[PDB]
Design a protein around this nucleic acid. Structure first.
Lengths: 267, 46
RNA sequence: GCUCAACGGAUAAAAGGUACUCCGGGGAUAACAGGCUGAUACCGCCCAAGAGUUCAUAUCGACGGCGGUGUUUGGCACCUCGAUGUCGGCUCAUCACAUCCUGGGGCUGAAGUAGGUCCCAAGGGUAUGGCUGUUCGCCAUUUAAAGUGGUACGCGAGCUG
RNA sequence: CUUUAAUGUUUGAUGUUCUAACGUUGACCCGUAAUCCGGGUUGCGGACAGUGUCUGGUGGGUAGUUUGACUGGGGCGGUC
RNA sequence: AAUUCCUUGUCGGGUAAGUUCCGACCUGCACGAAUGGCGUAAUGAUGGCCAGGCUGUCUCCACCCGAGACUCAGUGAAAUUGAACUCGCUGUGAAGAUGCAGUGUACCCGCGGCAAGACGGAAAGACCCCGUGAACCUUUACUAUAGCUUGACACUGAACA
RNA sequence: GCUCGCCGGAAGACCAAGGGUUCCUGUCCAACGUUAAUCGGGGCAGGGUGAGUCGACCCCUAAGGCGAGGCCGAAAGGCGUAGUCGAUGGGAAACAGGUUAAUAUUCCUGUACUUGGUGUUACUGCGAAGGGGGGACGGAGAAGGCUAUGUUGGCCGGGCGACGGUUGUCCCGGUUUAAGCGUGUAGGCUGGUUUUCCAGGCAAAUCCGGAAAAUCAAGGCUGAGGCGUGAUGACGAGGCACUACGGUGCUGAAGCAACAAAUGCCCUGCUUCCAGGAAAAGCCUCUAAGCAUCAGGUAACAUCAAAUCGUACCCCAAACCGACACAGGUGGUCAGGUAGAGAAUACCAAGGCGCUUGAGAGAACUCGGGUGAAGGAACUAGGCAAAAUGGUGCCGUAACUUCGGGAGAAGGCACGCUGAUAUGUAGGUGAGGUCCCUCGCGGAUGGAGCUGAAAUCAGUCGAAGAUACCAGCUGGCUGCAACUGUUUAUUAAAAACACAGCACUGUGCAAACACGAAAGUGGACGUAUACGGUGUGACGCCUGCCCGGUGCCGGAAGGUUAAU
RNA sequence: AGGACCGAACCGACUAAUGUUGAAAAAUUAGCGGAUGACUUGUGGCUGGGGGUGAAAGGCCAAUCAAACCGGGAGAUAGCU
RNA sequence: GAGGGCGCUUACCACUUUGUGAUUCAUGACUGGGGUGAAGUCGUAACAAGGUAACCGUAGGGGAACCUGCGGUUGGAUCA
RNA sequence: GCGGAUUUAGCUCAGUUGGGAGAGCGCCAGACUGAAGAUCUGGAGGUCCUGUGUUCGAUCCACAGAAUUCGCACC
């Protein structure tokens, strides 16, 4: 939590010291361009995604693609998003329009927002990596080169431009650093917006996991009508895997389209 | 608990729905037995 | 031709505490008890060695023994597996006795004191707090009293577990 | 006539690939003030996918049996 | 702690009395690192006795307005069946006398006492097995089908090193 | 008559589950009210419930029906785009009276309105499938008004009120002021108005997003109601009457100021917090085309159409259901009343209507409890049953740091009821009267007419005054789920544990899972800090070690010896 | 501020007591909370067989369903009095 | 007619205790600290290279006898 | 009771066709030490439980017996 503004929990005076205490990032109305997410699981019919409780999803931020590149822009606000813990912000573009962008820690002043082929290197919408320098921070990455943002959020996943690697096949990231994807993908810069909402426990519960859903809570324990175990009397005691599919190491993948992973050192 | 028998019109459609009982072949045979071949009437059609 | 060695082999073969309990008959079925009567036990003692102080015959008991009220345990047996439902706190009071004194003899290892068990026989008390399931085992103060076989090991048309 | 070469003459096959297979649940263009859907350029990877048998075990995730009888009632120890 | 093998295991300190009001020399078979461990926030849909609270909580409830039910008027159905005029240990065992008779000889009715008596109801006993047997869950025993999962023919070519 | 009940979050209200016409009454006893029976929606003779506005049509939509062409399909069938269903989302939109047994936004009788034709005068250039404003939400709230509605009495109708008293200081009766027109006030929102242009807005724009100059500040959009307007409009004290004894026939008063408070109005104001409250549309304008000496719409007034229904009895609950006017359940609707922290409780005013078993008796039958001589739980599986103590405040209180908290800890205690300070204090209030001003929902001075603690110095009657209902025992411990608990209604009521971090783990992404035969819908409008294994046991430390065995798998040096 | 501490009909399910020969396959009385939401609360339309939603139950789910209340298989099997 | 005698009113104030802490004695109901070292028994690293040293904060294996690797200021033989 | 191990060097224990008696360890000698252990090289250390029989030959096996000892029978 060692950054600023850090916003600490209260003294032990009540049951909730945390959650997050941040002032200055909830506003209303839910402004003209918006939408929601629908009902409960309803997959048709015998539902496969467990425990549910599926009320209140609820609203989401409708801006994807974000391809508005060289039209320059400026910043009214920053907000929250509780679906992604994110530092999302209100970007007025000087043609005649307002968006919602995945911005870093304190990108306001109201700043100098602008992107594209050769034209800028600044804080910049969605920016082709072939046009720009080396750096640690990158963020957006169009997951395959015309699709859209691999990361919709600035949660600390530093995906890192390497320089002259393999003809344009850059990035040095999390679970497989030879992901090898072309610098024809678009960045934004960069991956630290809201550390605070994710560097600490929000709660045991808090509103994020009880007012509108249930998480996981059980699978193995209680009633043998499900998992491969285990008699009763509080004993269990057996050999019980995650059948038919396995658990604490094995791998699952052989073949698929793309399938670019090349070395994947595991552990 | 709220036990049991009561009348309504809008619960009818998927079970006691008179034209639904002509639309299913399940229903159709029984209707014809109960009042076309079998001498009789139903008339509770409001 | 074979651990087909369940050899007259209905099959090549896949296991369970009736601690879900049942289908038509429910002791033609094996809980303890209701008791036919019990060998192992209580109840009556035999003749005798013995060691009681230093005499057997009171106390007490060697290898030795004859027999019955059914509570041990057990040869278990029925009309009783469509109530045959179990404790053992009393409770309803009752039983006459393997003494339990309160006692009056007959006897003395009794001179009295005190110990010794035993016929004639079952009047009242069967109560105590800190203890645990306590029969059993106590623990302070105890009295006119401070005992005891089960009888289906006193109790569901009378007690909660 | 062979251990065997050089090359002709029969002929195959792993790598190494490029790419009218293909998949397009990636984009431009397009019918189309259109969530299915029509279709052409492109951009991608790649003979991949797919499943149908044979081999391998993996676990009590549907279904199944309750398999002798001998029983001073069963568990054991002994037999036709 | 659901280890405490023996034996009510302990020192006895306190207590009308330690089968503990706890008042720290152990007799530790088959104890504990996420089926974990040294400990604890205020809260009791508080599990367990031991105080001083008020006391009838025993033994002692012998006096009540009173519900009513017996009782007087309306009205009188079944969970379903052994005929009564059914002897209060009775004895005697196709092992249980309210019907094999040794006795005592109990007038007819309250359905008002209604205390052991259709062993009874509420009903295929729960204990429970002849069971050629309903399927009822699991386990490094049997497994099996769907599934997991790679490699191999199927299918989709060779040009070159 | 005369004395009191029950429902007291009424079976108060009209009307929605389609049950359906079984209310007033006129008449009665099987086809039944386990007494009577006169009453029960009993059940029979009349008739009835008067809706242009009430609401579901619409134009319409978030869930979810059906659906072209289809991708597929054994015959079955499934999943869908354009469409089209569709309220419980939303738009237009009934009151003062009077009027019948009823039944009543309806009936009338007046105000005068909503959608859309036509008519005569007037103003005036329009349009649409597309654009823009937002059309639009979640509760606890906060700040100030309006009085709903009450108690007073000036004043107005009675007059001095049967026992003891009463004849100006008392004691009773209405306390009403209709509408739509009319302007605007509480806080609120928002400095004004011409012009010139784009890296903008499905093709366009006198509209909306951004940008560029000129020239003035006091501009613009309403909001309860106060206040009025109407009104020689009514309602009504009370008189003379007729009568079918229900009632209407004539006639007719009185008519002001305050004081305290909502449930409710203003307030899609204004704040405070996040789980992050659904689109078309009414609201209001932009233009595409095409009309363009034609047509369109907005205005005055005259009219027309105002599209099958239902509207009867009935509900926080007897013709639903339960099926014995049932100790089941269980509502959206006027909010009746003082003193109450209050939907904590015995009293009320109605509306239904005291609800068809009570005469009497007074053994023992525990559906109960009490005050007990002695002792104080000398009872046992349940101090089980009967309690009791249960404010504001103090003459002042112990172990204990997660310095919140353990602390209404703990304790016993003045309390009834007047005086005096004060013919009411203090504290809320602001009538007049007098002034000033901008000229009108304007301010300043001023003390009316009401309200009302908290304590002081005095008083003393007891068995008793928190004289009554609401309502708690300090502990001290045994195991620390550490998050309130209502959790497996059905053994335990937790002594189950759902938390929640995390090392490792599933997938470099047509990502894991595949319910469905074909979806690609969850996860996703989303990346291996999203989402799933198998769990975690406040919090903070702490997880030694130990690989023989068996897991977990992962590999390739090389043997067991299959498709190939 | 808070799944506060102490608050109402909208919640259930602690042991009795008049619940068992029923007012009731369930509900109770003078008693008593969770005091705003690990609440429940009601018009309908997706889950229609060996079910399908998980505070995760062997309880459900017609009220007593380890699979019935189906009637078609079938007046089955039947070591059966 | 004034008190004092009293007969009222309430303290100061002795009892009492809600409380529980202070400390002073023995009853020290799983035993660990600093040593005399009546022959204790397993070790045995350092006071010369205590004969492949390691003193100085100390983290750490766990018979520690602290092994054992840095950073010195030479009370550790030299020509390393 | 049946079945089984077992009475084989101080110490732990190996061992058997059925004919030798073994080893880590311990003792002792040889020396290295003033001495002893280690480590060394040599020597030695036996109730083979008893009886009987098979047999060339029994430590062994089978049979009978003692005596420890282990599981199950017992409920």
């Amino acid at each position: 939590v060692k950054c600023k503004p850090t916003s600490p929990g209260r003294r032990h005076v009540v049951k909730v010291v945390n959650p997050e205490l941040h002032k200055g990032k909830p506003f209303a109305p839910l402004l003209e361009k918006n939408s929601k997410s629908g009902g409960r699981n309803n997959n048709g019919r015998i539902t496969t995604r467990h425990i549910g409780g599926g009320h209140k999803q609820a609203y989401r931020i409708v801006d994807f693609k974000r391809n508005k590149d060289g039209i320059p822009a400026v910043v009214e606000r920053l907000e929250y998003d509780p679906n992604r813990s994110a530092n999302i912000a209100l970007v007025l573009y000087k043609d005649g329009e307002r968006r919602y962008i995945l911005a870093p820690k304190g990108l306001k002043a109201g700043d100098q927002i602008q992107s594209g082929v050769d034209a800028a290197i600044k804080p910049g919408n969605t920016l082709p990596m072939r046009n720009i320098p080396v750096g640690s921070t990158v963020h957006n990455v169009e997951m395959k080169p015309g699709k859209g943002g691999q990361l919709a959020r600035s949660a600390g996943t530093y995906v890192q431009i390497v320089a002259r690697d393999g003809a344009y096949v850059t990035l040095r990231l999390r679970s497989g650093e030879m992901r090898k994807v072309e610098a024809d993908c678009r960045a934004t810069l960069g991956e630290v917006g809201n550390a605070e909402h994710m560097l600490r426990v929000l709660g045991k519960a808090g509103a994020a996991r009880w007012r509108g859903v249930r998480p996981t809570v059980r699978g193995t324990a209680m009633n043998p009508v499900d998992h491969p175990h285990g008699g009763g009397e509080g004993r269990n005691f057996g050999k019980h895997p995650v059948t038919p599919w396995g658990v604490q190491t094995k791998g699952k993948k052989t073949r698929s389209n793309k399938r670019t992973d090349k070395f994947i050192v595991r552990r | 608990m709220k036990r049991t028998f009561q009348p309504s019109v809008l619960k009818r459609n998927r079970s006691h729905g008179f034209r639904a009982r002509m639309a299913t072949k399940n229903g159709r045979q029984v209707l014809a037995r109960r009042r076309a071949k079998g001498r009789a009437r139903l008339t509770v059609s409001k």
